[PDB]
Design a protein around this ligand. Structure first.
Ligand SMILES: Nc1ncnc2c1ncn2[C@@H]1O[C@H](CSCC[C@H](N)C(=O)O)[C@@H](O)[C@H]1O
Ligand SMILES: Nc1ncnc2c1ncn2[C@@H]1O[C@H](CSCC[C@H](N)C(=O)O)[C@@H](O)[C@H]1O
Ligand SMILES: N[C@@H](Cc1c[nH]c2ccccc12)C(=O)O
Ligand SMILES: N[C@@H](Cc1c[nH]c2ccccc12)C(=O)O
Ligand code: SF4
Ligand code: SF4
Ligand SMILES: [K+]
Ligand SMILES: [K+]
Lengths: 384, 384
């Protein structure tokens, strides 16, 4: 009943049988005979189909989706972590980081700034991942409180991203919400290749909690077992060299979740500068746009998430492939009324490319002709 | 400005000069010329004064105090702990314990049982003590939420006992309350002798958080620096062989706190059965009553706390020396409507002597002629 990784050579054989031209000719809402992972792989590898042309087809295939876009802004509630991801500044072994923790007052204040000054109605809560059972339970407790507090303030959509979760940790978080609340669990597998995964996340059985690949990947299945609905898998683009392998696995994971009745967003964040202990693969814009396109096309009801990891000029080109736009900063309690958010290298998880205020970024998107749901521009008669 | 341990040989020399008969002749509210620690020591060592006679004098000296008694019931919110106290079942190295953790739902349910079925308006929240800064902050956060939740339910007095606390941990807890709220910090030094302390609590600088004697003993001073008022020092009777040394130090600590304007309760819990790694000194009833008497007499505005560690027959004899009566069980979420509380050896901190329901114990005290504040007997027209 739990997700099982696809056999990449099996998908390759099925991809060899799809007619990619016929696929592009499909009407919106119409579904290929072959599996999504096989169709995505075939589109990816058929270089007679230009990336620009794939992108236009993906945007059209997703064109009917309503709302076109919605938003959430991240709120990192702490930058403590017990794990050791080599591409992340929050890794426990990074003794250079200034560690911070938001209490009741600070979390509430940040939510009020986001709500009234940035005009947003979507928020995400983030933490590190912790090793011992009591710390994981206490973290779930705190984040559960934060989710409930946000919902009560009038946030209409809440994400959380707090590491892998076992059944009893979900129990503790779940006592804060209802099974029908608009709450999405985020757990990016980073890489679905077990060998690349171990290279960046570490080896198991040594107090490094995220090194357990399996606990992480079945977290959505536990969430669904408990009766919840919204989930957000992802790949960290730049870890594994073979992008065709990751897109096959992510699309396979999305497809599994869909079969279980879940609503899934799909995230493919691209690497940003951080205090790393191993370096990564820089993925060019064309490969990245091609990847987003084949995922968006074959998974048309599963929204891609685009974040301010990316610079303004890239958002300009890619926004049409996305279903979620998420501006913000990965620093602890970084927001302040009337000021740009902090992204201090001394305390941030990584450095973002776009530090413009969410309400500016989202306002410009709306002014260009795309409304953003969960955004209320704090303007005119809706200004205080 | 912080508490400094008295020099025991200096107190001995001052004790040699007090007239213990003149001391007993003092009118209530009148104060000896010598220091409290010196007077307590002299009363202790003057065996021409019988223990029964000391007890009668202490009770009379405290007779004017109003209310005569108030109550709180303990609620252990978890039995996880990172420390290694050799006399305690919750020590991390005790792999036999079944570890439990109460979330939002369970804590609320327990408070409602205590409030409506046991009729109590005083509660104490307890945890283990944790090593890494994030866990300590997350624990402070949770317990802060619990205190606020209890106060909002109508609890009129809340204790907490969650280990030593540094300034930033107090900050996190304090965001849940007001400086004038009826909230008491408990931090029992266990032994004021540094050598006995190290024997049971462990050596410092090795991830054993309670091994730091100094961080622990100045926790009240940090609490007072932040502008709070109520504190609860204690000695664990049975650790250190020389009781005269501990009573000198506890009375000295009480006196210091008083000088800083604090309201202090004083706790002298006696050892109970547990899964220990070192055994302790069994203190007989006469020594124990003599100890309670000299502390109660010399510190007449600082209430002794008596708990159901002690059997019914001992409470009968000692209750007149106490200002706080605290029935309950040191098991996680042990209460249930209409049932006696759990005290399961598989999950409890230690085994208590008296498992009768708080409302029975407190009702019998009231029926015998002593009202108990923060107790509303759920009887007659106050029954639902
Ligand atoms: N240098 C870096 N640049 C860009 N994204 C990164 C990054 N390091 C990590 N990330 C991504 O940030 C995401 C959310 S933050 C991590 C939250 C949680 N501790 C967890 O690890 O699941 C991570 O999952 C990762 O995909
Ligand atoms: N076997 C035992 N019998 C009786 N009391 C004990 C005991 N072991 C510990 N205690 C007492 O229980 C008290 C409260 S419980 C401990 C709470 C917190 N972890 C702390 O250590 O401060 C301890 O301070 C100790 O004085
Ligand atoms: N990293 C998380 C949270 C996030 C959302 N938008 C962001 C913008 C910048 C940094 C982090 C974020 C995610 O991709 O879901
Ligand atoms: N041990 C804590 C909490 C407590 C109060 N009353 C108790 C009765 C039994 C066991 C524990 C307690 C204390 O002495 O303050
Ligand atoms: S990616 Fe998450 S688990 Fe890994 S080091 Fe960073 S914060 Fe910790
Ligand atoms: S007395 Fe407190 S700190 Fe020590 S082992 Fe027990 S619960 Fe942990
Ligand atoms: K809008
Ligand atoms: K009463």
């Amino acid at each position: 009943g739990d997700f099982v990784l696809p056999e990449l050579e099996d998908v390759r054989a099925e991809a060899a049988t799809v007619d990619t031209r016929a696929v592009l000719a499909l009407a919106e809402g119409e579904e290929p005979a072959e599996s999504r992972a096989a169709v995505a792989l075939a589109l990816w590898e058929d270089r007679s189909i230009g990336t620009a042309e794939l992108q236009a087809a993906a945007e059209a295939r997703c064109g009917a989706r309503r709302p076109r876009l919605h938003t959430f802004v991240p709120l990192y509630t702490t930058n403590y972590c017990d794990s050791e991801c080599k591409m992340c500044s929050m890794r426990k072994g990074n003794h250079r980081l200034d560690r911070k923790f938001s209490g009741r007052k600070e979390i509430t204040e940040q939510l009020e700034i986001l709500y009234h000054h940035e005009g947003v109605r979507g928020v995400g809560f983030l933490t590190g991942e912790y090793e011992d059972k009591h710390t994981r339970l206490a973290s779930a407790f705190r984040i559960g409180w934060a989710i409930r507090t946000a919902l009560d303030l009038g946030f209409e959509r809440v994400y959380f991203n707090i590491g892998s979760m076992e059944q009893d940790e979900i129990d503790v978080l779940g006592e804060w919400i209802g099974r029908e609340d608009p709450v999405t669990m985020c757990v990016f597998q980073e890489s679905y290749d077990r060998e690349t995964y171990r290279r960046f996340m570490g080896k198991t059985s040594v107090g490094v909690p995220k090194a357990d690949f399996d606990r992480r990947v079945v977290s959505f299945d536990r969430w669904l077992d408990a009766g919840y609905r919204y989930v957000n898998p992802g790949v960290l683009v730049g870890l594994h060299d073979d992008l065709s392998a990751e897109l096959v696995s992510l699309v396979a994971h999305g497809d599994h979740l869909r079969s279980r009745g879940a609503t899934a967003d799909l995230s493919v964040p691209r690497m940003r500068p951080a205090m790393k202990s191993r370096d990564t693969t820089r993925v060019g814009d064309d490969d990245y746009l091609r990847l987003m396109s084949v995922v968006a096309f074959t998974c048309p009801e599963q929204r891609l998430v685009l974040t301010t990891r990316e610079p303004q000029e890239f958002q300009d080109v890619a926004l049409g492939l996305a279903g979620v736009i998420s501006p913000g900063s990965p620093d602890v309690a970084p927001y302040r009324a009337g000021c740009e958010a902090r992204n201090d290298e001394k305390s941030s998880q990584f450095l973002v490319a776009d530090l413009r205020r969410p309400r500016h970024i989202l306002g410009r998107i709306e002014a260009s002709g795309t409304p953003v749901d969960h955004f209320v521009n704090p303007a005119g008669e809706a200004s205080r």
